[PDB]
Amino acid sequence: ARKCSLTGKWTNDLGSNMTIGAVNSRGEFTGTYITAVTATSNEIKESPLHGTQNTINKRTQPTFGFTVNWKFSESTTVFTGQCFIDRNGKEVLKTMWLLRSSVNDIGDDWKATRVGINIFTRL
Amino acid sequence: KCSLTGKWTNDLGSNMTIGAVNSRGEFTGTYITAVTATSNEIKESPLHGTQNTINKRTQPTFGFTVNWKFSESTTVFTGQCFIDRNGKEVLKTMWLLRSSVNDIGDDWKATRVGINIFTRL
Amino acid sequence: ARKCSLTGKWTNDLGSNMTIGAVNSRGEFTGTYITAVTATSNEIKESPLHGTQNTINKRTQPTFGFTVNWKFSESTTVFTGQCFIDRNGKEVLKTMWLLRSSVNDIGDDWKATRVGINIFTRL
Amino acid sequence: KCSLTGKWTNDLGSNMTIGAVNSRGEFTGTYITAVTATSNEIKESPLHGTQNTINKRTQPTFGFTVNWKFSESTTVFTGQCFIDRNGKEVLKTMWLLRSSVNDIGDDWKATRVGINIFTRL
Ligand SMILES: CN1C(=O)N(C)[C@H]2CS[C@@H](CCCCC(=O)O)[C@H]21
């Protein structure tokens, strides 16, 4: 088995691209995220992401999570998933995400959150 | 106006502290739990995230990741900080708890979802 | 303790009310859903729901699922959960839901689904 | 022109069938799995749902509930029926798997979520 590393350049079937840097010995990493599309009426810009990889038992397919701090809207996405060596020997990030929109009144909180799923593959 | 910095709790009986929020929107914090999805002994785990600063809002959205120290899992949270006129702050979140699975054909059952409100503790 | 039954009239935090009729031998039930808020701009009609309670091992706190076929929107909400006897001995539906919007292009499927959670309590 | 009625599969190897959809949008179908979250023997299971017929879309939304016959669980699916240039149909869906828990204090860990595409069998 290889080790499934988070570090490097990734893409998805939405055509978003994301780059993750070194993971430090606390599991932290930083990177950038450029989306191809958007839920808002706003102009897209690349954005920073920050997260961690779980290092408990030093697993080769670790779980992780990261936050995308969108720099062109009031939104936040969080991703969480696992870095897998797929059947064909490629590393793949299997993720799910929550997209939280900003709402003006707490009475609209019920509808502020979308969910989805994305595979990331090495670009 | 609404700020993430503080000690906070939820109805599961978890306590979370988040420290100061830097110019870039970043913070760190701790998360201690009382109930789990594992048999392993509970340890305090660290957390990192960001609050969105766009248009300098007073009820910002945010996300963070909790890096479990007692299991192989990872939980992410995202929500929005709501404040009233008395300055009562509440964090309305949803979360995803990703378990580790040994084989990729098990990925489908690895993700649990739920919501939690956090109150000032 | 008591059998937690879905049959009856319920309410939530959002001010929605719903009535579930009798549960049949197959665990099927039908009902109506009347909402006090939406994520559209139309006028609220009462909407039909249909679902099932799970009757394996005849649990007193059964899981269930149902579909709300919105009569004033091109959307569908599904709910799934468990009928509990709460701490205070009152019957409660603890549910999670997905709200699926119609999108016009397949490329926009990603953004079509919201998620939340609601307790229902007896009206 | 996108319709639910048919025999379907997904990448987990479950096959579903759905019957005719009546004027009231209702259907019934069956669901057979090859993998489960349970240790019990798989049995085929019934499903019930509706397609949304408002403004009579060629690509309607829908939801259904799978009444598991071999565990105490319920799964609900919701999505949209997409049909392409040549009549190729696909159902884009998302689901919630609700497990049974004994105490209300355990409600929080009871729901998993995922996504699946169904294609014609
Ligand atoms: C493009 N996307 C992507 O590659 N995803 C995996 C999903 C999760 S975040 C969303 C984009 C959000 C921009 C924020 C906003 O519009 O509020 C979508």
Ligand SMILES: CN1C(=O)N(C)[C@H]2CS[C@@H](CCCCC(=O)O)[C@H]21
């Ligand atoms: C106590 N909890 C809490 O405050 N939540 C909002 C939910 C989401 S994280 C979960 C605890 C997970 C511990 C790690 C593990 O069990 O592997 C539960």
Ligand SMILES: CN1C(=O)N(C)[C@H]2CS[C@@H](CCCCC(=O)O)[C@H]21
């Ligand atoms: C009122 N609601 C309610 O009692 N919920 C638990 C949530 C789940 S469905 C949504 C209402 C949707 C109306 C249909 C539409 O907006 O297209 C919201």
Ligand SMILES: CN1C(=O)N(C)[C@H]2CS[C@@H](CCCCC(=O)O)[C@H]21
């Ligand atoms: C095979 N599956 C499938 O085709 N899915 C889309 C997922 C969501 S339901 C689950 C099967 C659950 C069986 C019941 C149980 O384990 O209690 C899995």
Ligand SMILES: *[C@@H]1O[C@H](CO)[C@@H](O)[C@H](O)[C@H]1NC(C)=O
């Ligand atoms: C993703 O990468 C490709 C290849 O580098 C580039 O053509 C494309 O524009 C990138 N996507 C975005 C959204 O910038």
Ligand SMILES: *[C@@H]1O[C@H](CO)[C@@H](O)[C@H](O)[C@H]1NC(C)=O
């Ligand atoms: C949380 O806070 C209260 C008082 O500050 C304390 O009694 C309790 O033990 C703490 N919870 C955990 C899970 O350690």
Ligand SMILES: *[C@@H]1O[C@H](CO)[C@@H](O)[C@H](O)[C@H]1NC(C)=O
């Ligand atoms: C819910 O029922 C209550 C009491 O019967 C009533 O005041 C209210 O109108 C109902 N809600 C809606 C949205 O119809």
Ligand SMILES: *[C@@H]1O[C@H](CO)[C@@H](O)[C@H](O)[C@H]1NC(C)=O
């Ligand atoms: C589903 O359909 C395929 C194609 O007919 C068949 O080989 C397979 O056994 C079926 N799967 C299950 C779980 O019944």
